[PDB]
Antibody
Framework: EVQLVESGGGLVQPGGSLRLSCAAS????????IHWVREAPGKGLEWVAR????????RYADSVKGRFTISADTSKNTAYLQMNSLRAEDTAVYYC???????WGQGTLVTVSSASTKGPSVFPLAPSSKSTSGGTAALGCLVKDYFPEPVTVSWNSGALTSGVHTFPAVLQSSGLYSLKSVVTVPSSSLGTQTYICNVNHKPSNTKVDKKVEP | IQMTQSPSSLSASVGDRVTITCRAS??????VAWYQKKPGKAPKLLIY???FLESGVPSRFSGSRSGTDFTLTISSLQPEDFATYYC?????????FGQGTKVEIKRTVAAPSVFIFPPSDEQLKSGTASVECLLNNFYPREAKVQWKVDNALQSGNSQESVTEQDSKDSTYSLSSTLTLSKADYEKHKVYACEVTHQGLSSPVTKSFNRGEC
């Protein structure tokens, strides 16, 4: 079974450096080309670089030439992307792949920004007092003012999954993200069941459980 | 060498024949591949060298070449086939990708259920006010939210986002925030979300009175 696993992504300042790794399993990178390909928000897929690990020959996209270096260590069956002079435009999910490109890794997120990490505030969206009796009610959580993405949300520590919608984050004018997670439940349950949204913002090590009460 | 992919999206039903095209800006011989991509997932190779089926890929997938034009066909669309598809030329360096084609599932019209939420006392205490509107489980995707404050139409101060198609009923949901300073929020009484959608015989409005339990 062929596998490729990327690591090393994270949040870095413009002008900074970051090294990604691509660990290969189930084949030897000596036998192939290894590529990096990235996906920036709304820019589709863009090839970044390639290497032939046997002789170390490399090729680069014009937009990264000079300031990125792709390399490989055949004795570790691992390839690398050294990224320097980073720009906001470099913010993307970075994938490695091999030679058509028949196998790809899961990707690693690189965010290039001068903004600091900030954990969210979490506020309840309380079910309406005019909820239709015996019908359907909606409630939710507002996960506000965090940076960078991503955040995850569950309900009742994962026990509640039906009727849950967790929305794409929106970027506010402040440069901070805001997102909503909602769930629809029966109206007859509002006075008898507890609803708690579990918010995790790993980039800031923030975990918040917020009870949403009628 | 650029790859011009059309359409950007299409909706189809299980069993349909689907056609996605890609035009290379120059000759690329048969050096074209097609990929499938699902959200949060790695791209998957479908077709290599224009027409060859990648091992393990279902027989319903095929590729064709006519000159500079490349065609991906799905003979009978299956439930697991709903995803985004990309063409790629690798005739020269750099290899380049089309902008992708998002394949979504057609279903019946469903009206949204609409809900409105005041800012929480907690957020107000912190000094800001987010007014929330939810449009739940509707189809098709096209929908319009109109915010009104004391019956005055709002524009410019809201942001919305939409989920991908639900894995069980194939609907969309939409979430909209009207953002106001606490000071401005408290200058007005009635907050309303008015929703227009094909499933609704006439627009639906949900509203609240500021301060009412």
């Amino acid at each position: 079974e062929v596998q490729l696993v990327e690591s090393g992504g994270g949040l870095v300042q413009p002008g900074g450096s970051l090294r990604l790794s691509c660990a290969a399993s189930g084949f030897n990178i000596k036998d192939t080309y290894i590529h990096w390909v990235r996906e920036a928000p709304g820019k589709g897929l863009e090839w970044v670089a390639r290497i032939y690990p046997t002789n170390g020959y490399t090729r680069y996209a014009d937009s990264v030439k000079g300031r990125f270096t792709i390399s490989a260590d055949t004795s570790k069956n691992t390839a690398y992307l050294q990224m320097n002079s980073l720009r906001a435009e470099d913010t993307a999910v970075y994938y490695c792949s091999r030679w058509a490109m028949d196998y790809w890794g899961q990707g690693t997120l690189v965010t290039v920004s001068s903004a600091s990490t900030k954990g969210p505030s979490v506020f309840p969206l309380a079910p309406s007092s005019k909820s239709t009796s015996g019908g359907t009610a909606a409630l939710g959580c507002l996960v506000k003012d965090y940076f960078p993405e991503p955040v995850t949300v569950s309900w009742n520590s994962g026990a509640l999954t039906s009727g849950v919608h967790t929305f794409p984050a929106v970027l506010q004018s402040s440069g901070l993200y805001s997102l909503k997670s909602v769930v629809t439940v029966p109206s007859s349950s509002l006075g008898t069941q507890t609803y708690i949204c579990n918010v995790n913002h790993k980039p800031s090590n923030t975990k918040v459980d917020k009870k949403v009460e009628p | 060498i650029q790859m011009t992919q059309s359409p950007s999206s299409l909706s189809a039903s299980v069993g349909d024949r689907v056609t996605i095209t890609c035009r290379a800006s120059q000759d690329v011989n048969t050096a074209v591949a097609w990929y499938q991509k699902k959200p949060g997932k790695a791209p998957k190779l479908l077709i290599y060298s224009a027409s060859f089926l990648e091992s393990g890929v279902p027989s319903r997938f095929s590729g064709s070449r006519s000159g500079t034009d490349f065609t991906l066909t799905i003979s009978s669309l299956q439930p697991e086939d709903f995803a985004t598809y990309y063409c790629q030329q690798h005739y020269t360096t750099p290899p380049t990708f089309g902008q992708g084609t998002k394949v979504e599932i057609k279903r019946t019209v469903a009206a949204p259920s609409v809900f409105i939420f005041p800012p929480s006392d907690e957020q107000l205490k912190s000094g800001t006010a987010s007014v929330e509107c939810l449009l739940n489980n509707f189809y098709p995707r096209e929908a319009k939210v109109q915010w009104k404050v004391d019956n005055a139409l709002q524009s410019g101060n809201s942001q919305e986002s939409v989920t991908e198609q639900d894995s069980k009923d194939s609907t969309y949901s939409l979430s909209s925030t009207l953002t106001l300073s606490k000071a401005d929020y408290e200058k007005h009484k009635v907050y309303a979300c008015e929703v227009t959608h094909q499933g609704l015989s006439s627009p639906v409005t949900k509203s609240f009175n500021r301060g009412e339990c």
